[PDB]
C-alpha cells in the first residue's frame, strides 16, 4: 500500500496504488516491458472501486478507445488471470466478453463495452497505450 508521496511525478494516486496512464504506442508485450522499466507492472484490478477509478480517468479523454492492462492467457494456468499469476477477484469483462481467443487484455470503449475488459489475439503487433501500477505490495 503506497502513500501519495510514493508516486513518481506524472503518476496518479488511488487506493494505495500509483498509476501511469501512458500514451506511448506499444504492443501488449512491449507495454508489459515498459511498465517493468518503471519498476512497475501493467495494472491489475482487484476490486470494483479500482475499476471505477480507472474508468473515471479513461472516460475523461476521447483520443484513445483502448489501454493494455496486466492480464493475458496462460496455457499452463489454462485461463485468463493477472500476470503475477493471481486469479481474478473482481470480474470486469465487458458484455459478451471474453471471446476466448487466448489473447491479452485491455480496457475497451466500443458499443456495449463501456470502458470494460476485452481480450485481443495480438499481443505483439497491435499498438496502443497502457496503464502501469505501483502497489508497494510484498
Amino acid at each position: 500500500c503506497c502513500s501519495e508521496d510514493d508516486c513518481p511525478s506524472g503518476w496518479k494516486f488511488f487506493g494505495g496504488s500509483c498509476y501511469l496512464f501512458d500514451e506511448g504506442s506499444r504492443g501488449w508485450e512491449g507495454s508489459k516491458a515498459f511498465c517493468e522499466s518503471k519498476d512497475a507492472s501493467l495494472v491489475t484490478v482487484e476490486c470494483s472501486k479500482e475499476d471505477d477509478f480507472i474508468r473515471g480517468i479513461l472516460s475523461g479523454q476521447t483520443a484513445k478507445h483502448y489501454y493494455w492492462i496486466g492480464a493475458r492467457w496462460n496455457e499452463e494456468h489454462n485461463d485468463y488471470r493477472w500476470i503475477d499469476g493471481s486469479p481474478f477477484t473482481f470480474i470486469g469483462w465487458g458484455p459478451g466478453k471474453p471471446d476466448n481467443n487466448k489473447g491479452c487484455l485491455d480496457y475497451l470503449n466500443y458499443k456495449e463495452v463501456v470502458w470494460q475488459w476485452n481480450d485481443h489475439v495480438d499481443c505483439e503487433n497491435t499498438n496502443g497505450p497502457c496503464i502501469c501500477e505501483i502497489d508497494c505490495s510484498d
Binding site: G15, G16, E46, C47, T89, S137
Partner: peptide, 15 residues
Amino acid sequence: CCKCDCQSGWEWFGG
C-alpha cells in the same frame, strides 16, 4: 475487498 481496504489489524489475501 480492495488490497488496501482492510481495517487496521486485518490482512488482505485473494480478494
